[PDB]
Design a protein around this ligand. Structure first.
Ligand code: MG
Ligand code: MG
Ligand code: ZN
Ligand code: ZN
Ligand code: ZN
Ligand code: ZN
Lengths: 445, 445
């Protein structure tokens, strides 16, 4: 089963045929990309807020307009999917999802209301793909550059009526029906610990310093609970690297930041008339990010390594979470940098999948976002920035959909791409909830 | 070769699985969708400015979030393609194309600068796919809801250094190298009459009132010239319908409006804080549109009827031009109405292609645009509007990339979809110029 090896511009983009990404007919290559044998493993990679615009902008800057993402762009089977949520009262569509309702959709196969994690509009719990994988004897992995309590990772492990229910205090206040001391299953962090994926890697160390109000581990911080329950805790690159096994006897929990993990690139925030009155920007490495903090690729590496020891197979989710957060912050360098960071993780995933040959790799986003690519001389009403790209030309980005401090999600359908067994099920128009049923059928759960 | 029959939500979108668009595994159907036999015919349908956003907004409004465009969404093979232009001075990428540069890319296989038609950055002419088709004995059709001099239909039949060169007068002023009296090939309209497609249908009667400055038909209107050269002129739906043949002896020229053809739906323009200050809008049919004006689907139908008589095959391009024009105008109803208009035309194309069996249908856009779907309570700096959708819920659209009176194109990659022989060549990441080569190779040109 082939990967797309090189769909860069093949020539002189100014000459006839020089911008072509194809060197010949694709019918045979695509025939060869279609198998309905069982997936042994799945790797799902989510660029949070990574719409087609975010992919294009990132490619334009980092690789040139005619360049090629050896990870993101390399998956042969592509479609567009819909990620609309539901209004909680009416059950009618709500055309722009948040991260919680969208992650709930691919992870349980039920649509839900903005802010819901692993529950439906009736607040009824539904099983997640990770829970099902594990129940079937599969190894399970949950990796993110966000706090692990954030919606995308949390959706695989927690069932709560509001995604703000990070730890015991939040939960008692905002999700009283989920609060442990009220007879509920507990906060997001408490539920994550109960779920006991083999491998869990991200930020969100700070919520683990809260103490439980009830239950078996009442009166201990959640970290202590984790330790008392046999988890291996690591906090940096070197300690992650040292881990040699992860399973149900010795699950791995990696906590790499108090909150979200730091982004890799620095650049200024976009500003009003920024493309006109401020110089073109070149992104630079983020000086506030220590090399000791593992990258998404490094996290993804170790996770594959440890999960792949399972004879029966694994489920792994990997989230480039700060594409979204930097898009909210109108920061093109931040956003682009996190798209590049995700492309690196996709590369590791496909290289693994290629050699093993029974692994379904999926790359998409939870919803679209604000950023747009506009003409260099645009006079726009929102925040803009000129950037010096790999091509040696200026690209302007625009953030035009919020007068408040945060730019907003958008509701456009967006790219979903796949490689490997059952990848066909991503092609054409689908819904985010199909992804659940695709993964479930692929793994035979 | 199957068409996607029904990818609407399959059940109760509030219940598990109810929002699925798929009813089972797609590997078989997709395999059955892959053929490398020759395309006898090609029907290329362009929604001008119809990015994924535009598709989604139109689906949400007209069919509901979980609805299904029986034309647009029914093509089984899907990918995302890049449409960047070139800076004429540098030859480097210009990340946001106009309609002229993009149409030149698929019609010719060469990238070019914004505003160029059938010429490269050096202002050298390159042959178009329609010209090549004609050369090989195939029937040729060129259909648009725009002025026939507008960029998209013009790119098939005209080679000019500026897309503004509608007729003799503009050409002498702005493309003196192309001016007939200066020894050039002529204005866009003169070159369209030389190209002599079998079927040409659109708007743009105005420029035909001009008289030529030189050549055999000096002093005659370009309308008189068309008639002196054996063209059959039609002007409304009944006259179009009564045409029984179109060929090189009697080429068909349909001029249904003085400028662009009138749009199908009316609604108010989006305004600053429009979603907040103005009630939700319901689009209505444009009561100023005479029913004697053929719709795009009616023009498509007649074109297919006439072109399909050629035993060797045909090439037909069909453009839903006013998606772009209404997006520029921040008019959600006009925009969505034109996307619905296009979907009707696509259904005609697919219906023909399914029975005929050797016809490749391609549906895409020239570039992306401004419109975004945003949360109903968004407070945005640009122009917004709340719409009452078919779901019985409010959608808000936003136009946030220009302070001037035209909303701007955007550079995001966007959906391309195909059905029929060689439709594989649209899947994955491609470039707009690959489409040229795909069409060329499919017809053995
Ligand atoms: Mg997230
Ligand atoms: Mg056009
Ligand atoms: Zn998100
Ligand atoms: Zn967000
Ligand atoms: Zn256009
Ligand atoms: Zn335009």
């Amino acid at each position: 089963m082939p990967v797309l090896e090189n769909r860069a511009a093949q020539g002189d983009i100014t000459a006839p045929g020089g911008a072509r990404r194809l060197t010949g007919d694709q019918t045979a290559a695509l025939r060869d990309s279609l198998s309905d044998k069982p997936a042994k493993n799945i790797i799902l990679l989510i660029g949070d807020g990574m719409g087609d615009s975010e992919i294009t902008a990132a490619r334009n800057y980092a690789e040139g307009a005619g360049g090629f993402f050896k990870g993101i762009d390399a998956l042969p089977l592509t479609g567009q999917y819909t990620h609309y949520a539901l209004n909680k009262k009416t059950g009618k569509p709500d055309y722009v999802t948040d991260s919680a309702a969208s992650a709930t959709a691919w992870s349980t196969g039920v649509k839900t209301y903005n802010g819901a994690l692993g529950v439906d509009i009736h607040e009824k719990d539904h099983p997640t793909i990770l829970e099902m994988a594990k129940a079937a004897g599969l190894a399970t992995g949950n990796v993110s550059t966000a706090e692990l309590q954030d919606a995308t990772p949390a959706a695989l492990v927690a069932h709560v009526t509001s995604s703000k229910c990070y730890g015991p205090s939040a939960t008692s206040e905002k999700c009283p029906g989920n609060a442990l001391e009220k007879g509920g299953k507990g906060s997001i962090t408490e539920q994550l610990l109960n779920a006991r994926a083999d491998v869990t890697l991200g930020g969100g160390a700070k919520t683990f310093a809260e103490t439980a109000t009830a239950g078996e581990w009442q009166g201990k911080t959640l970290r202590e609970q984790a330790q008392a329950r046999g988890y291996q805790l690591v906090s940096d690159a070197a300690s992650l690297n040292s881990v040699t096994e992860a399973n149900q006897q010795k699950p791995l929990l990696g906590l790499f930041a108090d909150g979200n993990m730091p982004v890799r690139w620095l650049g200024p925030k976009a500003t009003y008339h920024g493309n006109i009155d401020k110089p073109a920007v070149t992104c630079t490495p983020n000086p506030q990010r220590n090399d000791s903090v593992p990258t998404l690729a490094q996290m993804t590496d170790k996770a594959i390594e440890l999960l792949s020891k399972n004879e029966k197979g694994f489920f792994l989710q990997v989230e480039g979470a700060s594409i979204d957060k930097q898009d909210h912050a109108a920061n093109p360098c931040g956003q682009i940098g996190e798209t590049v960071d995700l492309d690196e993780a996709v590369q590791r995933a496909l290289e693994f999948a290629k050699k093993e040959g029974n692994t379904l790799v999926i790359v998409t986003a939870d919803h679209a976002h604000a950023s747009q690519i506009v003409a260099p001389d645009t006079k726009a009403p929102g925040l803009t920035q000129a950037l010096n790209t790999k091509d040696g030309a200026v690209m302007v980005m625009s953030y035009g959909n919020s007068e408040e401090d945060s730019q907003e999600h958008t509701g456009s359908q967006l790219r979903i791409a796949a490689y490997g067994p059952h990848a066909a099920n991503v092609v054409g128009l689908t819904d985010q909830t199909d992804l659940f049923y695709t993964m479930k059928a692929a793994l035979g759960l």
